[PDB]
Amino acid sequence: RGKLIAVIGDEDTVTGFLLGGIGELNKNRHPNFLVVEKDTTINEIEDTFRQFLNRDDIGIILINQYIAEMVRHALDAHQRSIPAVLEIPSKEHPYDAAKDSILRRAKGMF
Amino acid sequence: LPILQSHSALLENMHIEQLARRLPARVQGYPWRLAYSTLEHGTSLKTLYRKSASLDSPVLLVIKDMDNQIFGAYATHPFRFSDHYYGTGETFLYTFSPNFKVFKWSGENSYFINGDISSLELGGGGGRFGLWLDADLYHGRSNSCSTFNNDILSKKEDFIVQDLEVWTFE
Amino acid sequence: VCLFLNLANDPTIERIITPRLALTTAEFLAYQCEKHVLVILTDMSSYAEALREVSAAREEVPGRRGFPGYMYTDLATIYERAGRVEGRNGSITQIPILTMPNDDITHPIPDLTGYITEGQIYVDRQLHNRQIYPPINVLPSLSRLMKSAIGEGMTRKDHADVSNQLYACYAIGKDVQAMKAVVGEEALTSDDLLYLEFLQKFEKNFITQGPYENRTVYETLDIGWQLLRIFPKEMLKRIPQSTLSEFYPRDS
Amino acid sequence: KDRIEIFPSRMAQTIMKARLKGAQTGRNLLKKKSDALTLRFRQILKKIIETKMLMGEVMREAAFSLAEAKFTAGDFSTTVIQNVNKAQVKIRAKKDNVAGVTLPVFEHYHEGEQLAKLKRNYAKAVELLVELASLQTSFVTLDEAIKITNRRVNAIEHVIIPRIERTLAYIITELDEREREE
Amino acid sequence: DELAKLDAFVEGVVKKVAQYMADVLEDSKDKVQENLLASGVDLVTYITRFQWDMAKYPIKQSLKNISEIIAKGVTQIDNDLKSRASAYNNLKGNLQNLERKNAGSLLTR
Amino acid sequence: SDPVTSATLGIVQVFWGLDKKLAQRKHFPSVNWLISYSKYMRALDEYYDKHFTEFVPLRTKAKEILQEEEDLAEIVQLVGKASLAETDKITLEVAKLIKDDFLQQNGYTPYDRFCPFYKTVGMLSNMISFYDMARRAVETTAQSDNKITWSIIREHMGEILYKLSSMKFKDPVKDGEAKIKADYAQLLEDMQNAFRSL
């Protein structure tokens, strides 16, 4: 049984972390991931994040940091330690170091 | 040819020459590093175990008693806590009496090394131990044991440790 | 030994007389017959009990916490019959033994005794319950004149150093033992594990003694060095390097 | 209220003195627990940022591996995202303990050659994601435990001990008044 | 299966430590083969006269335990060769580079 | 506290104090085993040496367990038990066995109306033998991949805990010295066999 690594991002960043033999669709046929196509509404991103963030299948959610900045409202509001949310990179983007919603607790200590 | 140690307060070039000629092919040509010394790390068996707990290589126990006689063991595995005997037949006991003598495994039984919470012992064959040391590294004993067929390693069956070193080949 | 016995059902004026016969004998033996005298006075709280009973027969008003207003002057008359004097080779040393109610050091008897005498040795219910003898706790205990008793030509040169280092390691060991149940022993450093080994061996080897076992100051100091040798000499912060050079290594 | 409302007696002195040593002991043990939680916390913080530095390497190399594997094969992303099914690589949820606090962590498990190089480089990457997630979910839990412990230490020092000491001073005062009346 | 994999590793280690000994000795395969030995006898003599070395690999261990003793010993030799070979080859490489700067153009000599 | 108690303690060689926590938890006899004392023990130890030999060690170890647990019982109010080592959990749980199945005694039931000294030494000898073997199992499996816990011992040895807690029910009016000793000795063998089976 275990737990799953959910993914939200660009289509190649959804193909990565999947081609490794990773991620399913559950009994309701809802997938472990969503592709952010260029026209995707900010609601479809935050509401799919909210669905992965409250699903017992999941242990980690991976989110491109440029869309983690779009879902920044629900994302930094996640004070729980049950799932992890990771503000991952993309081919077109700076790497994951700055802003991080968990790391920023240590506001003068890293 | 006298081997490349990092120090020693018990041993001398008389002892290092005569030891380096006996150690197994497994350590021929390695530098000797001091894992533990009662004269530097403080005197307790819990410290000797704690300092040995990271190793994965043979060791040489060296002892000096209150009669200044040097003796010990070469042991194929680190000194550690155990509920049963361990080690393999390249293990041996040695003593400078003042002749160098070495007592290699007799073939009779596999009772090489054991270590309780409160003592450390080598050899077996009845109630006998070739070497036994208490939790304080203060009292110890040696008798003839059938694993090695040793002589009494000290001048006396019961001895007091003056100081002790454990070397390792790394 | 000269021995004076007053029983619990003897007349209570004999209890008033007893310290005064004892100290009048100690003053003759020390300041005329030139002896060094040790005076042991057993249960001063039983003396204070009788002093209150005499005061009530005089119809005097009970003073503070029930005892006579002059009880400081009365105890000081017993305790200050002590010391060395110029021109005489004898001396009087005293050990008053006291019992505290509720184990409370703030009661008048142990309180007023602390203003007149120069130290305390402290007998402990937790050491007694753990079955240690003698159950003396070295942390609240003190001898104020210790610096004048110890040292070269009077005990040994290392006594001043070894006493201070043993106290420090016992104090630290008691703190590590308390936190062991808070954090669990797997959180402890290798330094904490040396102190928690010292603590157990100090109470078994140094504090614990037989009621018929006699140790000189030299056996007392040598058992001290057998425990300090648990530590690497660089952790012995209170001992100067001159003392460590002579005494830390085992001799042949 | 300023005082604990026991009634003045030597029994009350005995109780309030026992409480005062209990509170002063409790303070000092909880201050130690705060230091112990803080030490682990600042260690896993350094491991969080160090895992993120390694992610800054291997995720770029895995993204490059995907671009090269796609350049080699035409594509996968059009097909494998639609062709979702059972998966062979997953997480086990796992625990650690620190000064009596329990901390959440995760464990990785299994249930043209550019695609094989890709699978290895994404395996490296998800081991860092499991590592980071473990450290971060521990860190969030441990941060809360530090805040709770410091709150208790402040309550013992600023609420409880003063209330005991005022109570003890009142009892010591009233015992002198009863003694003067007598 | 496990021993069949392990044999194809220890053969690899024996060949590496012999190959590298020819390279360190610089000269020729025959001069090296004259000095390929076990216990102080030639390979043919040793394989012909085999007796199990129960000091090192104890007979009363389970077959799985004997396997892991032999795998750990040969693994240590493979690591210690790698280190000792790196450390010595660097001296030879750098010394030749100084010779390549005694040689070469006046522009770089 | 009061003058009559304070005057009495200067004289009497034995004092038994009440505990209101025991009395209000309906634990009987409700005597406090930490403020009570007896000064006759050195006089009696030659009688115990003559007639029992084993009892002086048992008395000593029982008082250690009861005092060691009283310090742990302060710290668990701060930290909520989670930090505690298995040797020390063993010490909490055996202290409770002693408090509920040795120090507790029903005063009206025929089997415990009067507990003779051969019954008294027999019960405690078994409980201290259990403490040694249970603690030895935990300590001997530190520094190891398999580590014993109180929960492992409780799962493996529930019948021995049931027999130990039941040792009080032996009735000295119904059963003789020989039977009561043999029953306790059989439990000591059941304990040893269970620990040898672990």
Curated annotation (Swiss-Prot), chain A:
Tissue expression remark: Expressed in brain (at protein level).
Chief localisation class: membrane
Any one GO molecular function term: proton-transporting ATPase activity, rotational mechanism
Source superkingdom: Eukaryota
Keyword Ion transport among record annotations: yes
Keyword Transport: yes
Disulfide bonds: none
SUPFAM superfamilies (UniProt xref): AtpF-like
A GO biological process held by the record: synaptic vesicle lumen acidification
UniProt cross-references to Gene3D superfamilies, sorted A to Z: ATPase, V1 complex, subunit F
Keywords, sorted A to Z: Cytoplasmic vesicle, Hydrogen ion transport, Ion transport, Membrane, Synapse, Transport
GO cellular component, as recorded: clathrin-coated vesicle membrane; extrinsic component of synaptic vesicle membrane; membrane; proton-transporting V-type ATPase complex; vacuolar proton-transporting V-type ATPase complex; vacuolar proton-transporting V-type ATPase, V1 domain
InterPro entries named in the record: ATPase_V1-cplx_f_g_su (IPR008218), ATPase_V1-cplx_fsu_euk (IPR005772), ATPase_V1_fsu_sf (IPR036906)
Localization in the cell: Cytoplasmic vesicle, Secretory vesicle, Synaptic vesicle membrane; Cytoplasmic vesicle, Clathrin-coated vesicle membrane
Membrane topology: Peripheral membrane protein
General function of this protein: Subunit of the V1 complex of vacuolar(H+)-ATPase (V-ATPase), a multisubunit enzyme composed of a peripheral complex (V1) that hydrolyzes ATP and a membrane integral complex (V0) that translocates protons. V-ATPase is responsible for acidifying and maintaining the pH of intracellular compartments and in some cell types, is targeted to the plasma membrane, where it is responsible for acidifying the extracellular environment.
Family: Belongs to the V-ATPase F subunit family.
Protein name per UniProt: V-type proton ATPase subunit F
Gene of this entry: Atp6v1f
Swiss-Prot record, chain C:
Protein residues bound to ATP: R144
Localisation: Apical cell membrane; Melanosome; Cytoplasm; Cytoplasmic vesicle, Secretory vesicle, Synaptic vesicle membrane
Domain of life from the UniProt record: Eukaryota
Tissue note: Expressed in brain (at protein level).
Task of the protein: Non-catalytic subunit of the V1 complex of vacuolar(H+)-ATPase (V-ATPase), a multisubunit enzyme composed of a peripheral complex (V1) that hydrolyzes ATP and a membrane integral complex (V0) that translocates protons. V-ATPase is responsible for acidifying and maintaining the pH of intracellular compartments and in some cell types, is targeted to the plasma membrane, where it is responsible for acidifying the extracellular environment.
Subunit structure: V-ATPase is a heteromultimeric enzyme made up of two complexes: the ATP-hydrolytic V1 complex and the proton translocation V0 complex. The V1 complex consists of three catalytic AB heterodimers that form a heterohexamer, three peripheral stalks each consisting of EG heterodimers, one central rotor including subunits D and F, and the regulatory subunits C and H. The proton translocation complex V0 consists of the proton transport subunit a, a ring of proteolipid subunits c9c'', rotary subunit d, subunits e and f, and the accessory subunits ATP6AP1/Ac45 and ATP6AP2/PRR.
Record family assignment: Belongs to the ATPase alpha/beta chains family.
Stated name of the protein: V-type proton ATPase subunit B, brain isoform
Source organism of this protein record: Rattus norvegicus (Rat)
Residues of the full protein shown: 257 to 508 of 511
Curated annotation (Swiss-Prot), chain E:
GO molecular-function term, one example from the UniProt record: proton-transporting ATPase activity, rotational mechanism
Annotated compartments: Cytoplasmic vesicle, Secretory vesicle, Synaptic vesicle membrane; Cytoplasmic vesicle, Clathrin-coated vesicle membrane
Signal peptide: none
GO CC aspect terms: apical part of cell; ATPase complex; clathrin-coated vesicle membrane; extrinsic component of synaptic vesicle membrane; plasma membrane; proton-transporting V-type ATPase complex; proton-transporting V-type ATPase, V1 domain; vacuolar proton-transporting V-type ATPase, V1 domain
GO biological process assignments: synaptic vesicle lumen acidification
Taxonomy, superkingdom: Eukaryota
Main localization (coarse): membrane
Tissue occurrence: Expressed in brain (at protein level).
Presence of the UniProt keyword RNA-binding in the record: no
Similarity section: Belongs to the V-ATPase C subunit family.
Its biological purpose: Subunit of the V1 complex of vacuolar(H+)-ATPase (V-ATPase), a multisubunit enzyme composed of a peripheral complex (V1) that hydrolyzes ATP and a membrane integral complex (V0) that translocates protons. V-ATPase is responsible for acidifying and maintaining the pH of intracellular compartments and in some cell types, is targeted to the plasma membrane, where it is responsible for acidifying the extracellular environment. Subunit C is necessary for the assembly of the catalytic sector of the enzyme and is likely to have a specific function in its catalytic activity.
UniProt protein name: V-type proton ATPase subunit C 1
Organism: Rattus norvegicus (Rat)
Gene responsible for this protein: Atp6v1c1
Full-protein positions shown: 56 to 164 of 382
